[PDB]
């Protein structure tokens, strides 16, 4: 199975178009969006090519292939525009060998862990920092941000391919971090 | 390569609950998927047979670590405080080889308000208390009916996913009420 | 200013009809309902004359005079039946010389206090125990339950009259507790 | 008796915010009532004049202890974590002698979806960015309009309750755009 992950888009049209381009070329079946989709975010500058209404038209074109959770920056007006369900604060995704716990990062995350099974995967964003590692009995995965990178990391996205979780550079496409989840 | 058991619209019926649980224990299924309306009978419904919310809670908690549930229109916060598994999520997902199952109760997204889905995906819901298993257009609809207050003259039922087939099964007979194959 | 308070009805039709009779005779302009309206409650025995669908018809007749907040036992189906807004976890009511902070008691209450002004009033239920006293710089008020009282108190309701907060017995009509707030 | 100032649909406009705050400080009003859509411009709207969310936050917090607000369709939880006063409530109330003021943003309850109210009560809302002050049927409708993005050729505005009259006032001129007496 092949899944693509994207998070903290914050209204950036160019980041969105590049994501949708890589999605189409990857062959992945679904696109998981971890929150903070249109709103740039009160405490920071507008991202490159900020254009909420256009990001909306682009994303709504693959709405039937999107799985998503509510970011701290997402609001009711956002759901009214996006043709896929974003209001759930968290959502589990059942895979053959394990579970994926999807959440933005502000309500649940590394500091407030959910009950899970050994080798399950905690998937979150919000921090804008890439992560692909084993933490205790479970795995932690954060695809970083596709628009507002932090900690010196390049804009990035995530990918699940053949039991391997990888954080990939949006432009470079070089592997930032990865871990096998067998 | 995946097996799941589905139970919906329990509404506090202890008999339905004990039976669901013995069947679950025998199924060999990885998870018990509860589609909502767990303890409350519902202001519009007459009490179910064997209405005993307090006891239903004790029983479901025995297998809490293996339950995957979604919020029903009759579920409230007191219910979440009693049950030891997450019941507040409005929807959740199951991913197979090339298709996905969209799990929801039926009052938010349903037959008359479809979520966006791809060809050959499955909308899994309860709420109506009417069993369904069929291809409706480009997607598949699946409703395992109510395990305690069936409507339309149907028997109380539950559902099962056996890799590529979804079946609605009578709770007493264990006879097939309806089933559909979701192979491309 | 004359307000009537009722809480933890839990589907009791007789309790409801008695409340509506006292409301009509009191002259009060509004009826404040603190939650837990139709559902008897998972761990409780059915109250006297349990009949949610009938409580709904009675309450909906004075819907335009009701102010309410979400009880821990209230659900989406409940809002669908009641013709007045109940989904808010809490609401503030502005009066001439002070604020009323209305909440059920499970999220906010004596143990998780909201920020308020000296002499404001914390109004809550959920415990089924009557209260009318000053605590710290603010007042605490709980009209008790009208259908399933605990502690040893009779079924009761509340009243705001002449700047005096009173907890009154549903039958006796005797004063259980009270405190002047001005 | 009762004096209140109303501001709605700020949408992150720092100039509108500083002006609202200077007027509030001079009004003598007991509370500043914010009807929603505080920091986000809204995906459907062009940025308003002087869009500076971060700064609007610092300024509104200086008077946090005197704000009474209700949630707008554009407000999110990041906004709540920044602002030091409660903004999540969908509605709240003001009680006069024999009348009731129902405060809400306008996307949940509004002109086209009325809450249950008694005769001579007031529905107070924003969201449309169109000022209103009139009796409609048996109740009164009052909308301060937007302090930053007015529609219909109207001036940026705010609102005030001075005992028994509700007025929509231009933010620059301080001239009366509309007003209604709610005496019964
Ligand atoms: Zn972010
Ligand atoms: Zn975030
Ligand atoms: Zn049901
Ligand atoms: Zn239902
Ligand atoms: Zn109660
Ligand atoms: Zn309660
Ligand atoms: Zn607006
Ligand atoms: Zn709005």
From Swiss-Prot, chains B, D:
Mn(2+) 1 binds at residues 9, 11, 37, 129. PROSITE patterns: UPF0025 (PS01269). Keywords: Hydrolase, Manganese, Metal-binding. GO terms for molecular function: identical protein binding; manganese ion binding; phosphoric diester hydrolase activity. Gene3D superfamilies: 3.60.21.10. Binds 2 manganese ions per subunit. Phosphodiesterase activity is 25-fold lower with Co(2+), whereas other metals do not support the activity. Changing residue 74 to A: Decreases specific activity with bis-pNPP but does not affect specific activity with pNPP. The keyword Hydrolase applies. Shows phosphodiesterase activity. Shows significant activity toward bis-p-nitrophenyl phosphate (bis-pNPP), an artificial substrate commonly used to detect phosphodiesterase activity. Also hydrolyzes, with lower efficiency, two other artificial phosphodiesterase substrates, thymidine 5'-monophosphate p-nitrophenyl ester (pNP-TMP) and p-nitrophenylphosphorylcholine (pNPPC). Shows phosphomonoesterase activity toward p-nitrophenyl phosphate (pNPP), with much lower catalytic efficiency. This is Phosphodiesterase YfcE. It comes from Escherichia coli (strain K12). The lineage of its organism: Bacteria, Pseudomonadati, Pseudomonadota, Gammaproteobacteria, Enterobacterales.
């Amino acid at each position: 199975m092949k899944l693509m992950f994207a998070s903290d888009i914050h209204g950036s049209l160019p980041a969105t178009e590049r994501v949708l381009e890589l999605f189409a070329q990857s062959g992945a079946q679904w696109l998981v969006i971890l929150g903070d989709v249109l709103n740039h975010g009160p405490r920071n500058a507008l991202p490159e090519g900020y254009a909420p209404a256009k990001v909306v038209e682009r994303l709504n074109e693959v709405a039937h292939k999107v799985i998503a959770v509510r970011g701290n920056c997402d609001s009711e007006v956002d759901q009214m525009l996006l043709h896929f369900p974003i209001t759930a604060p968290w959502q589990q995704v059942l895979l053959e060998k394990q579970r994926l716990f999807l959440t933005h990062g502000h309500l649940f995350g590394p500091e407030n862990l959910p009950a899970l099974n050994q080798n399950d995967v905690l998937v979150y964003g919000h921090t804008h920092l890439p992560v692909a590692e084993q933490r205790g009995e479970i795995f932690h995965f954060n695809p970083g941000s596709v628009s507002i990178p932090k900690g010196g990391n390049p804009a990035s996205y995530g990918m699940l391919d053949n039991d391997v979780l990888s954080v990939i550079a949006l432009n470079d496409q070089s592997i930032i971090a990865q871990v096998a989840i067998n």
